Amino acid sequence: AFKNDDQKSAYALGASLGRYMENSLKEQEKLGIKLDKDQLIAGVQDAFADKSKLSDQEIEQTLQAFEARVKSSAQAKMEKDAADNEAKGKEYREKFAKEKGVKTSSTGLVYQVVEAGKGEAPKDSDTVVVNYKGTLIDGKEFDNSYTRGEPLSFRLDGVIPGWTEGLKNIKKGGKIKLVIPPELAYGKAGVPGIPPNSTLVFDVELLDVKPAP
Amino acid sequence: AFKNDDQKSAYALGASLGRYMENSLKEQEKLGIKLDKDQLIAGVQDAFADKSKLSDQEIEQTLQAFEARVKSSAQAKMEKDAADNEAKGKEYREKFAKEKGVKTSSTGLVYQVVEAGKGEAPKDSDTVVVNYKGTLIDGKEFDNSYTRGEPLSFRLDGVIPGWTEGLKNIKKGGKIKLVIPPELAYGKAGVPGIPPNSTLVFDVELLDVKPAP
Ligand SMILES: [Cs+]
Ligand SMILES: [Cs+]
Incomplete structure (x- = not known):
């Protein structure tokens, strides 16, 4: 559904950027960050149309702040997962200790x-x-x-x-x-x-x- | 018009990508390439929604071909501008040669x-x-x-x-x-x-x- 190169290339270009974003989001999700997807597209559209609700300076300071929020969210995730893992772990260790021939050292x-x-x-x-x-x-x-x-x-x-x-x-x-x-x-x-x-x-x-x- | 960080960051992220594209296009335009703007956005949307009309392989081979088309379009522009510049130039040289005290060497x-x-x-x-x-x-x-x-x-x-x-x-x-x-x-x-x-x-x-x- 491309009638010429101008159209196909443009679309390919967008597609590659759309995939880029999709994959970045999935990366963010694993750090416990879930971005509003409609806003992401709305930013692309607004800026492309020269009507961004954020100034270039804002955009830049927000991304810097987002970086901090990612490092920080990762930290929080790490600790959450740490608590869940030991909860699971403690239960597993406790079941296994009840099996035949199993001993638990003082450590x-x-x-x-x-x-x-x-x-x-x-x-x-x-x-x-x-x-x-x-x-x-x-x-x-x-x-x-x-x-x-x-x-x-x-x-x-x-x-x-x-x-x-x-x-x-x-x-x-x-x-x-x-x-x-x-x-x-x-x-x-x-x-x-x-x-x-x-x-x-x-x-x-x-x-x-x-x-x- | 952002009610939270999730929304603001997402938008900032899109905006920065939207500006990135806008500026790349202007770069392409100076090489004589004008991409269909609606298709560019349609690619971003489709891929983001997991409905790109191009496969990942296609997207990649098309971008490679676009690179070639840019180098090539630049070449063609260079030659077009070369012809226009000498047309203008010849006319300027010819007017100036008609002025007082002006000489044109055999070269x-x-x-x-x-x-x-x-x-x-x-x-x-x-x-x-x-x-x-x-x-x-x-x-x-x-x-x-x-x-x-x-x-x-x-x-x-x-x-x-x-x-x-x-x-x-x-x-x-x-x-x-x-x-x-x-x-x-x-x-x-x-x-x-x-x-x-x-x-x-x-x-x-x-x-x-x-x-x-
Ligand atoms: Cs035991
Ligand atoms: Cs003269």
């Missing part, structure tokens, strides 16, 4: 030894080799050793405490399920890939234990 | 010695010091020595020929008006600040003549 680690292991147990300065699979309590995975095409080996005092504590509950050749509260893991802050305050679930197999070189 | 330089000068006349390897004022035939200035807060000094074989030829028609202390056709100047191409095929008009005063060091 709050919930663990289940599945195979005792016959070697010895690692200590803080030891390098461990492990197979593992980790997920969030909704069951979605963030790490799989397995799929990575290989197991991992690392010194034990480097990793998060929930883990270092957990792997000390078994010996070489052992298997253990760890349910780690956020404070033994990535905290309320969290890290890229792990949401704020999340409880982590790991199946771990300890393949080997080596002393610090 | 097409049109010149008018206003004060003969009493020194000697520069030669190609000489450094000249000059006052000058240059404009296009519509009378708009691109250079003023005068206003620059100073006169200029340069070797004479470096500058455009129309000039080097012209300043040889007077001696130190002389004054001359030069009307230079494009081929003795910046050509059909032209240079930043000088439109394609423009005839240049200079009032020049030769303050000094020095030999190449």
